[PDB]
């Protein structure tokens, strides 16, 4: 998208890592309380850091499918497993003609660090199939997905205990259903956990409430934790809260649409929505329900009645918050000086080059990094995986017990008070509030997903802020996130003896 | 080695394939006895040929080893499995800093076509570890080999029934022994065929007589089959036989040395020997046993007392037969016009670019192609694999029975003659000749390897010659070999229904 | 059986090994082609020899059976796997109250060296169940055998690719049939080689012709090879051949009975037969079929009509050849001076202590050692295992072809002779001798077992004699055998890198 500043994607992520490694290297050496206090301490710390960076296993595939017209075609595919310091590996499947070994390796490493940031016990992985799904029938896409699943399974690149895929660009519920069905019907036929081989499944198939919207929901929570922190909003020259703010959204897919829904719900105003074919704009606000309904009907956002076909880059629209939610390397050395927003919330994976990060720093623009902000997807995938391993819906064993227990608890307060203020205090009814009445039976699956996600995004934001203050990083939240990720992954490699050697 | 003519190695091999595919496409379509004779027959033929060309599975590895000095290093590795129309896959392991995904994919496809040429029932595969072995201790090389084996085994890229490695550049007997030992001691502990997981083993560990020298022995047999056809020697302006010819050898490794031993044994004269550091030259002849003894003593060819340090390209030395036995892409557009030899016998894999083949054709230079000429290695690896599966040394069950049987057979002739020519004819002793006495017990392992190899190289040469005449290919033996390979591999894909789709 | 001289059985075998190790160390060090020509050479030779001696894996079992009367009883069992330099492991199952961990470890190591002596590609193993089979019903023995098989199988101590048992003291065809049936019906249900999990099976279940008598047949061949070498019979002061000699047999089981049958068949005369309850004696000779038919009828040897209940040790009976074919450590310090025989042929495993070997050497008594002499059992077990892996009876594919081929061969001689001695010489019939007519179709299973065994015993006797001359060992054949065994096993450990460490 830019021939001036177009770094190799894997190496760009390695650069981000190098930078966080630079900052913590002292802390790692000093923690290390080995008798070698000689600066082979320094040496073993940077030997371990070199082990963490490259992907351990990458599988490249070519397999034939026969198209609906009868033609034979060769499909190309890839899956990278970056780290196995936690198992299984976790990461999505991308259907796109931009798929390549380097793109997949880069996203696989992002998954490792992202999972470490939100304390999700998975190593990183990613897959890609180099096709444009719009050029294939549904029957052909099913054939490609099912065959890809078996080629991965034959070589140990999918399974509930090694590698658990998930949706990404141009895949969703539908593909995940296909993956889970052919895994469970063949190699997983005797495995009690066969349907935990993949997440993002439909509900009828072991999916979890809110997985489709989960990463949008997490984008809201990530922004909210920082947009409500007066210390960061001072440096930006902006007022805490959502009620008065504007935002623009690049990409109207699963991440972009649901980020818009939740931000709109809490008083922000969507001004611009950009897509693969063009952009639309309205300074008075775009309604997400109307835009979705139009998009579902016409297969495009152009021509939306209540906004005007906007020319020029969606990334340079004037707004408070820019949400790049499409592909990677969209903000570069070129357009970074014209961005006009004061908060960049990366919903997409790797939308900002390192050169663009430098410009944004100089310019007091806050980039909330992908490592943290889009990790709501993998957090709720983690909940889905646990739901599959546990083989019950949350609360089903305890709803009645817990309901009865709570009423007897409140009755214990009632009877204790009547016992004391006897006859002429009268009857002293203790009853639930409206809000407690609605929790009287304990959490359900929906409650766990919402509160578990909010808990994770908040706990992770505080850890990033703590680390940024400690090292005087200002608005370089990306380096603070990598610092936390590196510290966690380093400790695992260090206390494990590294490897089987 | 040449920046004028440096084609991508994988695509260069696909180019060779495309050529042979051109020539046979008609014969494939006409053979095809299917009800719908539309030249959409031609469409299925060219869909199948597109399926055959790319590698099905490629695994890329990164794993850490701790060096002898205590530092951590990250080792990079690769194994490509090109085709599974026959199983297991078969191919060597190369230790070299020139190793790359493309190099490994290219050699893996060469293995498929090579195996089809000599009727060896294996699909093609190849592996590479990106190190220079003369920078590592023996203890480090053992560590790297054993760990590489486990990483391949975990993902299904080594095993007696999927993929059976073998030596290549900078690996031999020693590494194969390490591979077999860690496979059999871990995931092969219950497998009756665990030691058939790799070939080129030492004899004490399941190796077969003559595997080290097998590919040199096959180079001799391949040359002999063509150097003794007067029709091809006419076109070259040359006398049949070896007794009178000179040759030069690029590379003094396992292929180069043994090619020189066998050619020297049958009256050819080695004039020049080139190496990674320099060449040596002597128009009176170099003796292989003194050269190897010098090489073993000094670790180099230079300074050999009975030849001179030759400057300028070994490939340009003046001789009848040039044997490139080092790495690939050594003969290019550049130096092809200065070659001076009349026969180029490719012992190495892919030593000649397609441009250089152009030039050699115009100038009536016969290139005996790698597909055919170096296939003695994989042929004797095949014998080793069968020896492992059978769990007896050849002849051990039958030596005594067979010898007793032969003497009673000769005695049947004796007694029949005496009965007829009674007393007046006397005693009529029927005894073995010296050469039959030597076979009186039947074949041993040594005999099977020697005669089985000779049988294969001759039968394959006659098939290549038959095909070159039938398509008027003259001295383009490479295209004739690919034609035979394609025909055989196409038949398997066609009658199998292609794939489970 | 003797308090004076009753060494620990495992260490006694280690003593034999140490003794052969002492003689070959120099040869091993000098062979060793390595740069550290230091006595770091002798150090690694000494370290490898220490690795070879102990057993790698020993499993000890306790499992309950409910007896026919309804009581519960706890059965004790053991299986030792001594070496895995060849796989699978091979060794018998002994039912005896004298079974112990040390006894089983000792016999397991004997199996390793024995297999190396006759070039049988198995590592050594042995099993024992500590019961007296005479105190159990057939139903109880079946339950014990089947349960023992499952306990071994669960832990990887039986299987066609790890460990293949066989009969020993108080087990035979019957028990092996039980073992094979429960293995193949449970854990081996999908294994193509399930019935190769054990040898010594009945013919109807994959057994091989002559396995029951095989170790007796090998005892005859082992004696033959030495009793016909005039150089050894000189030192003994006796006449080559069998026709004039006497022998006594301790133990009338599977080894003892069949040794007697074959020796009797070639003109030796059995004077004395000893068993667990007593011995019998007759200087005119005992006939083996009469004595077996009496034993089958009465369950004992005593009271045999044609011999006299002999008192005093069977081992001291006056004869030329003493065949101990019962348990171990029967010739000791004590009774070695009173032996009276000139040749001691150990059919049993470890019947002679090292002190008794000392005495026999001083008195010019030839001990043909167990390592060599009783290895006909494991040699024919090896043939049975191969028969199972091959899934055809020998010759079944080729009988008709070979018979037709031989007649056309003889007809080629006949027609060639007529077409030269025309009608001047008449018809010249070329026909098989009686002996060749018997072989006209090629070998059958019976022929391979007989000639394969004879071939093995005589090639092994040669190697022992060669090695005894070369080191001036005289009549210390035991040390010569261990020397050959050690050289072969050392080579494997050396060129394998020892272990994955
Ligand atoms: N799928 C998930 O749960 C998660 C996805 N992500 C990342 O979010 C990003 C996008 O989210 P997806 O779920 O893939 O959405 P999606 O694949 O459902 O839709 C992507 C949208 O972006 C549009 N698009 C593509 N290129 C564009 C361009 N140059 N300009 C404007 N629009 C463009 C497409 O037309 C489509 O509307 C990806 O980078 C993905 O890796 C991150 C975390 C979780
Ligand atoms: N084995 C499999 O293929 C699947 C297993 N599961 C397991 O079930 C556990 C609980 O999830 P749920 O309680 O189902 O969520 P849930 O109770 O919210 O169920 C949602 C939907 O599943 C339906 N459902 C329940 N039992 C069914 C049955 N026997 N046949 C068809 N539909 C049925 C419900 O009626 C509802 O429509 C999960 O932990 C997961 O491990 C879930 C889905 C598929
Ligand atoms: N080893 C085998 O079983 C078979 C090997 N081949 C091919 O034969 C070729 C080499 O045989 P290897 O067994 O690997 O020999 P090797 O690896 O034992 O020795 C290779 C020799 O070539 C020399 N060499 C390397 N680069 C050179 C250069 N640029 N110029 C001159 N000399 C150079 C090296 O110093 C070494 O002496 C490779 O292309 C291999 O793929 C083909 C069929 C079978
Ligand atoms: N399980 C393993 O690791 C090995 C298995 N084998 C199997 O053996 C079969 C036949 O090969 P061989 O007959 O060995 O070829 P071979 O008869 O040429 O013997 C090669 C060498 O192995 C030695 N050898 C024989 N038995 C031995 C033992 N028990 N311990 C140590 N060394 C011994 C021989 O003395 C000879 O020097 C092959 O089909 C193969 O499947 C062979 C070698 C290693
Ligand atoms: N059966 C086989 O395949 C082979 C067995 N062996 C060994 O040969 C020896 C003989 O075993 P098998 O004949 O198979 O067993 P078996 O059970 O058929 O014969 C043993 C016989 O010796 C008798 N006996 C036991 N203790 C005695 C003593 N102190 N004095 C005299 N007789 C006694 C028993 O009552 C029984 O009659 C054993 O040491 C065994 O380890 C060796 C090679 C092969
Ligand atoms: N799967 C099993 O349990 C058994 C398998 N086999 C396999 O057969 C191979 C060759 O041995 P054989 O040819 O049996 O030697 P063989 O030809 O001497 O057969 C021995 C006896 O088995 C009988 N037999 C043959 N086929 C039979 C059938 N379908 N049903 C019942 N009885 C039959 C024959 O009449 C013969 O008398 C062995 O390598 C072995 O693994 C042999 C015996 C049992
Ligand atoms: N695309 C889309 N998804 C919706 C819409 N409304 C609800 N969902 C999603 O459907 C799932 C179930 O929705 P609800 O039953 O309303 O429960 P909910 O979790 O309170 O919904 P939300 O708070 O909006 O996430 C959630 O993942 C919602 O985000 C919608 O209008 N459009
Ligand atoms: N490197 C090397 N190998 C040799 C040499 N001589 C023989 N060999 C190989 O070592 C193995 C054992 O040699 P031999 O016992 O003579 O068997 P062979 O088949 O008659 O030997 P060749 O016909 O020369 O291959 C064979 O594979 C030989 O090719 C040599 O001088 N140098
Ligand atoms: N216990 C016992 N076994 C016998 C007897 N006779 C033969 N056998 C064995 O039973 C099997 C059948 O023997 P045959 O069919 O005659 O074939 P064979 O190979 O010529 O037998 P042998 O030369 O005695 O080994 C062979 O293994 C014999 O060794 C016997 O009298 N008693
Ligand atoms: N593919 C998403 C989520 C992966 C998952 O849910 O496992 C990402 O890029 O983070
Ligand atoms: N590596 C050799 C032979 C491989 C094998 O023997 O399997 C080749 O390039 O053909
Ligand atoms: N148990 C016999 C051999 C058993 C077998 O044939 O494997 C012995 O002591 O040698």
From TrEMBL, chains A, B, C:
Predominant cellular place of this UniProt entry's protein: mitochondrion
Origin superkingdom: Eukaryota
Residues holding ADP: 85-86, 119-120, 209, 387, 393, 396, 459
Span of domain Glutamate/phenylalanine/leucine/valine/L-tryptophan dehydrogenase C-terminal: 208-497
Family the entry assigns: Belongs to the Glu/Leu/Phe/Val dehydrogenases family.
Oligomer status and interactors: Homohexamer. Interacts with HADH; this interaction inhibits the activation of GLUD1.
Name of this chain's protein: Glutamate dehydrogenase 1, mitochondrial
């Amino acid at each position: 998208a830019d021939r001036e500043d177009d770094p190799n994607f894997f190496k760009m992520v390695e650069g981000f890592f190098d930078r966080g490694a630079s900052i913590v290297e002292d802390k790692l050496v000093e923690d290390l309380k080995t008798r070698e206090t000689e600066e082979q301490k320094r040496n073993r710390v940077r030997g371990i850091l070199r082990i963490i960076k490259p992907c351990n296993h990458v599988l490249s595939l070519s397999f034939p499918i026969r198209r609906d017209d009868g033609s034979w075609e060769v499909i190309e595919g890839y899956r990278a497993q970056h780290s196995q310091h936690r198992t299984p590996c976790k990461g999505g499947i991308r259907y796109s003609t931009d798929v390549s070994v380097d793109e997949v390796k880069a996203l696989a490493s992002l998954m490792t660090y992202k999972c470490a940031v939100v304390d999700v016990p998975f190593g990183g992985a990613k897959a890609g199939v180099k096709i444009n799904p719009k050029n294939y029938t549904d029957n052909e896409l099913e054939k490609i997905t099912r065959r890809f699943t078996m080629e991965l399974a034959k070589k140990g690149f999918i399974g509930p205990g090694v590698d658990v895929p998930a949706p990404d660009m141009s895949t969703g519920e539908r593909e995940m259903s296909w993956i889970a069905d052919t895994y469970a019907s063949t190699i997983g036929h005797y495995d009690i956990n066969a349907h935990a081989c993949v997440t993002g499944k439909p509900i009828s198939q072991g999916g979890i409430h809110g997985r489709i919207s989960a990463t949008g929901r997490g984008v809201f929570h990530g922004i909210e934790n920082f947009i409500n922190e007066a210390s960061y909003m001072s440096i930006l020259g902006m007022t805490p809260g959502f009620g008065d703010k504007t935002f623009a959204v690049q990409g109207f897919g699963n991440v972009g649409l649901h980020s818009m829904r939740y931000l709109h719900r809490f008083g922000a105003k969507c001004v611009a929505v950009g897509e693969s074919d063009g952009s639309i704009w309205n300074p008075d606000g775009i309604d997400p329900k109307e835009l979705e309904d139009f998009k579902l009907q016409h297969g495009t956002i152009l021509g939306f009645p209540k906004a005007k076909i906007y020319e020029g880059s969606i990334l340079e629209v004037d707004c408070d918050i820019l949400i790049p939610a499409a592909s990677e390397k969209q903000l570069t050395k070129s357009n970074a000086p014209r961005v006009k927003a004061k908060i960049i919330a990366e919903g997409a994976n790797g939308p900002t080059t390192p050169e663009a990060d430098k410009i944004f720093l100089e310019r007091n623009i806050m980039v909330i990094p992908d490592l943290y902000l889009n990790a709501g997807g993998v957090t709720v995938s983690y909940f889905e995986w646990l739901k599959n391993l546990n083989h019950v819906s949350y609360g089903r064993l305890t709803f009645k017990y817990e309901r009865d227990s709570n009423y007897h608890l409140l009755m214990s307060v009632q009877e204790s008070l009547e016992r004391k203020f006897g006859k002429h205090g009268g009857t002293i009814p203790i009853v639930p509030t409206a809000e407690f009445q609605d929790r009287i039976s304990g959490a359900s699956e929906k409650d766990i997903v919402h509160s578990g996600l909010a808990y994770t995004m908040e706990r992770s934001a505080r850890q990033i802020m703590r680390t940024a203050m400690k090292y005087n990083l200002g608005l370089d939240l990306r380096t603070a996130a990598y610092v936390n990720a590196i510290e966690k992954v380093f400790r695992v490699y260090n206390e494990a003896g590294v490897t089987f050697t």
